[PDB]
Symmetry: C3
Subunit: 152 residues, 3 copies
């Protein structure tokens, strides 16, 4: 009760210090390759890789390829693409069933920002998705190299 009192007051000061310090470091971490939106964080590796390699990199790091689920998330992701001036791969593919794009979990899309006419499975071999500097999406061959951006 009494001793417990001080202990609680001491913890409050320690917690406040951690909160202030962490707040500062979050900003530091995101500069210049990250974007925070809601409770999601997008971070680019800064280089390009084919889809399979990009996917593995994100998976191994405990995240997954960028998967914008709203206009807000897509705009945040667009900021990184614009900054690096390099279109990036999204996590979604229609490799299982042509014409039906899904997230790595198999769930159907809850948001999309396809450029006019897309997806068009050009050449009959486009099962991956890239996001342009203007934020629009286009289905593209998974063998192509695009900016690696993961979400955590």
């Amino acid at each position: 009760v009494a001793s417990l009192r001080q202990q609680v007051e001491a913890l409050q000061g320690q917690v406040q210090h951690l909160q202030a310090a962490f707040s500062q470091y979050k900003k530091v971490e995101l500069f210049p390759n990250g974007q925070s939106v809601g409770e999601k964080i997008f971070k680019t590796a800064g280089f390009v890789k084919p889809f399979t390699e990009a996917q593995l990199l994100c998976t191994q790091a405990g995240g997954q390829l960028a998967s914008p689920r709203s206009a807000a998330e897509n705009a945040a992701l667009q900021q990184l693409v614009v900054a690096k001036n390099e279109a990036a791969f999204l996590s979604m593919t229609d490799s299982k069933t042509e014409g039906k794009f899904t997230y790595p979990t198999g769930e159907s899309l809850v948001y999309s920002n396809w450029a006019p006419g897309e997806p068009n499975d050009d050449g009959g071999s486009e099962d991956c998705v890239e996001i342009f500097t203007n934020g629009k999406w286009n289905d593209r061959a998974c063998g192509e190299k695009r900016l690696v951006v993961c979400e955590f």
Copy 2:
């Protein structure tokens, strides 16, 4: 009961303090410098002043603004490490011959190289810091290392 939960909380906080301390060192390696309560971090690339300024602002910070010999030395470490002169936040764009911080406040510290600022060519309103730590006013259109402070 409450005494058992408090010890559990104490343990969680001690763990966080240890984990956070380790994480701070990791984050700052190799592009950051901690001095006092300020943190300097370089983006690792060069940009013209206006662009560099926007990058820092959008990140929730601002261009490096050394306010003491100690901060200037910390900033100097990053410049030396990348071997690339960097832009500071200060400019005399509003009133030629009078440098101020983004807020409009006058300088509280300066480390100008001999003869500077000299508004060379009548068009130097930005400031760069060299690997030796000294400052020189330069054209804002030139590209220099982007270093922000948080």
Copy 3:
């Protein structure tokens, strides 16, 4: 009463902090870091001679990569492979030729020498590099290798 509620509220903040921190740790490690046990390896992304690399890590509050187990070596190997550049380890045999030690002076507790190593080629190889295949080779300290520090 008020104390208990004050403690439960404090724990709510602490667990929220734990969650935020966990997310930011993963973000931090991507793509230049690797965590293994309580150790963290992080590459600077560039190459430097041994003395300079050692100074960079020391000044950052850590030390050059010092894998002490197969698990740590495999973790470090991931970074070397990602950068496709052999990296320097912290150990040297500068004090006593043929006897590699950590910066502390302690003898190795783990090694993963490539066949035929360490050979002290030219009679002047007192530093250690780790290849993309995870094997070690003694190399001249003047050579430039990927900088990887451990924290």
